[PDB]
Amino acid sequence: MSKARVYADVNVLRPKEYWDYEALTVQWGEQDDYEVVRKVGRGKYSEVFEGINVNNNEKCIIKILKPVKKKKIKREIKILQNLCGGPNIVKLLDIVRDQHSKTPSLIFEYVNNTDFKVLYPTLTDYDIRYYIYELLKALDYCHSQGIMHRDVKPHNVMIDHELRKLRLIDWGLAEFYHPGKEYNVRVASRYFKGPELLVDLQDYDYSLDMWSLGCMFAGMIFRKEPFFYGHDNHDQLVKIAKVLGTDGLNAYLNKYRIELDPQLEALVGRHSRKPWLKFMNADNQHLVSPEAIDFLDKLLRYDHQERLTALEAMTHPYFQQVRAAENS
Ligand SMILES: N#Cc1cnn2c(NCCc3cnc[nH]3)nc(Nc3ccccc3)nc12
Numbered sequence: 540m541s542k543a544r545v546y547a548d549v550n551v552l553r554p555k556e557y558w559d560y561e562a563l564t565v566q567w568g569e570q571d572d573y574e575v576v577r578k579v580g581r582g583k584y585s586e587v588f589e590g591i592n593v594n595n596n597e598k599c600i601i602k603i604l605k606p607v608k609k610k611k612i613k614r615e616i617k618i619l620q621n622l623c624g625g626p627n628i629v630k631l632l633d634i635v636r637d638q639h640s641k642t643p644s645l646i647f648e649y650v651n652n653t654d655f656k657v658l659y660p661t662l663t664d665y666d667i668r669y670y671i672y673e674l675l676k677a678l679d680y681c682h683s684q685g686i687m688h689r690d691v692k693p694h695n696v697m698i699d700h701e702l703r704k705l706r707l708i709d710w711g712l713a714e715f716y717h718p719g720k721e722y723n724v725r726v727a728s729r730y731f732k733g734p735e736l737l738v739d740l741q742d743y744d745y746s747l748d749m750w751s752l753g754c755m756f757a758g759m760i761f762r763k764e765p766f767f768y769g770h771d772n773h774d775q776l777v778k779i780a781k782v783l784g785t786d787g788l789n790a791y792l793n794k795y796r797i798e799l800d801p802q803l804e805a806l807v808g809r810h811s812r813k814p815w816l817k818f819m820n821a822d823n824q825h826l827v828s829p830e831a832i833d834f835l836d837k838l839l840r841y842d843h844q845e846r847l848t849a850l851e852a853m854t855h856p857y858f859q860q861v862r863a864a865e866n867s
Pocket residue numbers: 579580581582587589600629647648649650651652697708709
């Protein structure tokens with residue numbers, strides 16, 4: 540029986556309407572208020588375009604969704620409305636649908652993002668600390684509001700490097716946290732899936748996002764994208780095991796009375812824990828200081844209950860300069 544160590548009763552104390560997303564009644568806006576300027580991306584759930592609000596002539600992002608269940612879309616809408624306004628949380632501006640096809644589109648604030656594949660390689664040591672701190676603000680905020688993002692990864696972190704503005708987007712996999720609830724483990728992107736998802740521990744919590752953040756962080760300071768490069772869910776756990784070691788995995792499994800599938804246990808085998816510094820090289824040396832390793836280490840723990848909370852992470856000395864700078 541696992542439960543969050545913080546913000547566990549957020550949804551218990553709030554009005555039921557706050558988390559009963561299925562009770563939501565979507566208020567559709569005017570589809571003609573937004574015009575497509577150009578396609579900028581795509582996903583398995585939608586096609587994304589840069590658009591313009593014809594009223595104020597301001598830029599926006601139009602997410603045209605592929606067929607989606609009513610329950611599914613209400614969850615994303617409710618979460619966005621509940622979090623709108625919070626620190627670095629992308630803003631949902633409008634919700635519209637095509638009368639004939641019934642195809643819905645979500646209108647979001649526009650961020651002049653730079654592809655992380657091109658951006659990250661140019662980030663200085665300080666930039667990394669700064670942006671990670673900014674992302675942390677978003678995570679502590681949503682967690683404090685009883686919400687798990689469940690899909691933290693570079694693709695879901697828009698960054699306007701010129702303005703140094705960051706936004707956590709794509710809350711389509713986000714869910715409300717309720718003590719004891721068993722969630723679907725089929726969330727997050729493979730390279731950022733926490734051990735709990737990989738071993739089928741369903742009663743996970745906000746801490747899942749902290750593992751994902753840890754993966755992202757490791758990728759940045761060690762300049763290895765992604766850090767844990769697994770081919771499938773089974774291989775993903777193996778890649779993790781080969782770094783953190785199997786002893787820790789075994790202890791984790793025994794603590795939560797979890798039994799790996801025979802095939803998986805075979806693939807994982809036995810591995811010694813590899814020190815973080817073994818991943819240091821001339822390409823990343825200017826980024827792998829003791830404070831960074833200490834911070835990463837406290838994020839990447841098998842036991843989700845062991846990981847730093849977003850609030851704790853923000854106070855880690857690794858971010859002391861960012862904090863001092865902010866307190867000015
Ligand atoms: N919300 C939000 C959100 C806010 N900005 N934003 C941007 N801004 C950059 C637009 C751009 C202009 N030239 C290249 N890209 N892109 C995507 N893209 C996206 C793509 C696939 C899946 C999800 C998001 N999503 C978003």
